[PDB]
Amino acid sequence: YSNEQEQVLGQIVLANFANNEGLASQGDNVWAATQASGVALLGTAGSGNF
Amino acid sequence: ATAATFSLSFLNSMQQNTGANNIVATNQNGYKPGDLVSYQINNDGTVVGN
Amino acid sequence: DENRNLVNMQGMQLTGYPATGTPPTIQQGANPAPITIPNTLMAAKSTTTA
């Protein structure tokens, strides 16, 4: 901002998987989660498995 | 937290006029906790997670 | 960097042997730690040996 100040507005989450190669495509360049692919497993982009 | 009692070994030392004093090796088997970064398969046959 | 650590062109910290003591010297076997160049001012010291 214009007063020597910073603010945050959010932080993008990433999503790992227990298993790739099981995600299916449904047209556009996106993937839908399926059975035999796992739960979402959201997280942050800094550390850990991401 | 519960404090420990540990055995400290000055084994394999020397005193033979090698200039001045300097440590050459220090080790122990304690570590802070952490989570799984990455798994790999070596060529001898094992699977190892770092 | 912005808070006085010896840092390369991408944001990682050059580490070395930490300096401790009054007067500070270098311990030749410690576990390494980042280096900070402090902007604090030297406190005085009483005379003990002439």
CA distance B48 to chain C (A): 26
Q: Which residues of B touch A49 (CB under 8 A)?
A: 35-38
Q: Which residues of B touch A48 (CB under 8 A)?
A: 35, 37
Q: Which amino acid makes up residue C27?
A: Q
Mark whether C and A touch (3+ CB pairs within 8 Å): no
Q: C1: which residues sit within 8 A by CB, 6+ positions away?
A: C7, C11
Instruction: For residue C35, give the DSSP letter.
Output: -
* Nearest-angstrom CA–CA distance, B24 and B20: 12
B26 CB within 8 Å of a chain C CB: yes
Q: Which amino acid makes up residue B37?
A: V
* Nearest-angstrom CA–CA distance, B3 and B7: 14
Quick one: resolution in A? 2.9
* Nearest-angstrom CA–CA distance, B41 and B47: 4
| Determination technique for this entry | cryo-EM
* Nearest-angstrom CA–CA distance, B35 and C7: 27
* Nearest-angstrom CA–CA distance, A40 and C10: 32
In chain B the first and final C-alpha atoms are separated, in Å, by: 27
Which DSSP helix (H) or strand (E) runs through C19?
A: strand C19-20
* Nearest-angstrom CA–CA distance, C6 and B36: 30
Structure tokens at A1: 């901002």
Q: Which amino acid makes up residue C26?
A: I
Instruction: For residue C23, give the DSSP letter.
Output: T
The full length of chain A comes to 50
Instruction: For residue A50, give the DSSP letter.
Output: -
* Nearest-angstrom CA–CA distance, B22 and B37: 35
Q: Which residues of B touch C30 (CB under 8 A)?
A: none
C29 CB within 8 Å of a chain B CB: yes
